[PDB]
Design a protein around this ligand. Structure first.
Ligand SMILES: Nc1ccc(-c2ccnn2-c2ccc(C(=O)O)cc2)cc1
Lengths: 9, 273
């Protein structure tokens, strides 16, 4: 399963 | 004289938190992080006691810069024609909690308990100083790998803590509470507790529970990893759909799953060294 960062805003 | 007071090293990272360079203060070789923020990309502005118009991030960092190791410490700042430069402390060696969870997978509950406890103490410190971080997530948590201490970073989305409703938000959507998704409204403390529930699930399962708006407001938490009943209950409590049903910081730290937390030094020796 793809774990990813999430940019703010 | 910012060029003569610090020795600028390599680029540590960039993104929403501007551009951060490794640095050493020439006065005492103290490791510092030099963070540049463009003026044209600043949303909220504040004013210091001297009346100078500074970014709100500087205002919030000064209010929490009491020496409590749980938050990043602002050492100094400068104004440039088109940017602000922030001089932050730099613990060494560090890895952010996102990369840590990516490499290690789901954390043992003993380790997640120690990490979560320190995040709670850090957030309590912010609220006691009148500061709401509004972007609690693993990406904004640094781990001092030798001391076993966690540091909350990037106050660029924060605000002064108030008791009335917030209608603006610039944090991370997958950590934002369902009342923000549905009504674009939230109160500071209950919204922080929701993001802490997302963070705790992230630590004990290896990734965040929700990726889409429908999952955030859905109200169902599926556990993809073996998680103790006590930890599951605390997580589901933090992720209560109704804000008033969520626990206070005191109720979280009094929860049975949060008892017998390891000391930071014990955490580093058992899990990090
Ligand atoms: N993704 C990422 C890259 C580099 C760092 C980092 C290393 C040393 N300090 N430092 C750091 C950066 C920003 C802030 C801040 O915005 O407050 C505080 C500390 C952290 C995360």
């Amino acid at each position: 399963r793809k774990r990813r960062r999430h940019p703010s805003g | 004289p910012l060029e003569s007071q610090y020795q600028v090293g390599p680029l540590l990272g960039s993104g929403g938190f501007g551009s951060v360079y490794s640095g050493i203060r020439v006065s005492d070789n103290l490791p510092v992080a030099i963070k540049h923020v463009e003026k044209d990309r600043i949303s909220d502005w504040g004013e210091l006691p001297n009346g100078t118009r500074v970014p709100m991030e500087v205002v919030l960092l000064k209010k929490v810069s009491s020496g409590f190791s749980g938050v990043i410490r602002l050492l100094d700042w400068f104004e440039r024609p088109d940017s602000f430069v922030l001089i932050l402390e730099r613990p060494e060696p560090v890895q952010d909690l996102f990369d840590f969870i990516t490499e290690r997978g789901a954390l043992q509950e003993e380790l997640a308990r120690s990490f979560f406890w320190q995040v709670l103490e850090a957030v309590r410190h912010c609220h006691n100083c009148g500061v709401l971080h509004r972007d609690i997530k693993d990406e904004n948590i640094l781990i001092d790998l030798n001391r076993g201490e966690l540091k909350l970073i990037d106050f660029g989305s924060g605000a002064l803590l108030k008791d009335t409703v917030y209608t603006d938000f610039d944090g991370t959507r997958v950590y934002s509470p369902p009342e923000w998704i549905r009504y674009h409204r939230y109160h500071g403390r209950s919204a922080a507790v929701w993001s802490l529930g997302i963070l705790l699930y992230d630590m004990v399962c290896g990734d965040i529970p929700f990726e889409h708006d429908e999952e955030i407001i859905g109200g169902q938490v599926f556990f993809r990893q073996r998680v103790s009943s006590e930890c599951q209950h605390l997580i589901r409590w933090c992720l209560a759909l109704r804000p008033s049903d969520r626990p206070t910081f005191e109720e979280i730290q009094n929860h049975p799953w949060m008892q017998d937390v390891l000391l930071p030094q014990e955490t580093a020796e058992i899990h990090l060294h």
